[PDB]
Design a protein around this ligand. Structure first.
Ligand SMILES: Nc1nc2c(ncn2[C@@H]2O[C@H](COP(=O)(O)OP(=O)(O)NP(=O)(O)O)[C@@H](O)[C@H]2O)c(=O)[nH]1
Ligand SMILES: [Mg+2]
Lengths: 109, 173
């Protein structure tokens, strides 16, 4: 049944101006993607955790363009979030498992 | 800061959404079909004296989940509704694409251009120019025929869409 399909660190960026934000950790399960963020604050190390159901999550391959390299984007109302993988291999894997687990979700319903 | 115009390619499978995008972005065109999932492109251009950036979301003509499709559409500011002049069913499909877009955007005047691609294949035309123009006029939008192959009107559709997007922004502010 349920299991951990894939996980790893990513660096988030603001989509419109491509400004670097913070490191986050992604955990892919068989029907949703969990993104855990840790935003340091003066005296309240804030943490933003978001869960994205694969049957609602749009995953976009952001084509390489200098201010951008090895990134992909997640779109789910009301968010648009860009993430950078450590290298091209990691990006390829994320996109492959995201697509395959979504595919499996389909031939499961 | 450079403005950013978000364009969304919409249309049935095979109409040439990716080809139009790639011709505009890189001046390239290939004959082999390559089913798209979802790709994002960005390019710096000069729009009427201003250095701006255009962002193009190119996705598959068919998406299994309506919620996912809506998320694609919702991220956009303007749309190139593409159909192939050689396939009447792609032309028929535009009505629903438009309905889905108006709903998600909740705006009747959403920047939108009806695009008849593959104009170089005139000998195989299934959709007449009049049909398309008439449909476009009733939707209160412009119609343009393009050829991702010969570049005919390729820059024109993206730049015309950018100007409509820029227009809405000028007033809505
Ligand atoms: N002659 C000619 N062929 C074209 C033109 N535009 C696209 N094609 C061809 O038509 C096929 C489909 O084009 P493509 O851009 O992949 O279509 P798409 O709308 O992105 N398909 P999908 O939704 O599956 O991603 C390709 O083989 C391509 O070379 C055009 O203007 N003229
Ligand atoms: Mg395509």
């Amino acid at each position: 049944g349920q299991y951990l399909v894939y996980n790893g660190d990513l660096v988030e960026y603001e989509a419109d101006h491509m400004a670097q934000l913070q490191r986050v950790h992604g955990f892919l399960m068989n029907d949703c993607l969990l993104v855990a963020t840790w935003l340091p604050q003066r005296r309240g190390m804030y943490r933003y955790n978001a869960l994205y159901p694969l049957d609602r999550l749009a995953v976009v391959n952001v084509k390489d363009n200098p201010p951008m390299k090895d990134m992909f984007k997640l779109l789910m109302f009301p968010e648009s979030r860009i993430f950078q993988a450590e290298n091209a291999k990691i990006k390829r894997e994320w996109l492959e498992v995201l697509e395959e687990t979504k595919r499996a979700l389909s031939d499961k319903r | 800061s450079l403005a950013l115009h978000k364009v969304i390619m919409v249309g049935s499978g095979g109409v040439g959404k990716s080809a139009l995008t790639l011709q505009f972005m890189y001046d390239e065109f290939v004959e082999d079909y390559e089913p798209t999932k979802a790709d994002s492109y960005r390019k710096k251009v000069v729009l009427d004296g201003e250095e701006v950036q255009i962002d193009i979301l190119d996705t598959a003509g068919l998406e299994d989940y309506a919620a996912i499709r809506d998320n694609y559409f919702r991220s956009g500011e303007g749309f190139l509704c593409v159909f192939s002049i050689t396939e009447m069913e792609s032309f028929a499909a535009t009505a629903d694409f438009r309905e889905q877009i108006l709903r998600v955007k909740e705006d009747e005047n959403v920047p939108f251009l009806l695009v008849g691609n593959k104009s170089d294949l005139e000998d195989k035309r299934q959709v007449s120019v009049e049909e398309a123009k008439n449909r476009a006029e009733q939707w209160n939008v412009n119609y343009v025929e393009t050829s991702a192959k010969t570049r005919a009107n390729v820059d024109k559709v993206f730049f015309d869409l950018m100007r409509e997007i820029r227009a809405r922004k000028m007033e809505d502010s």
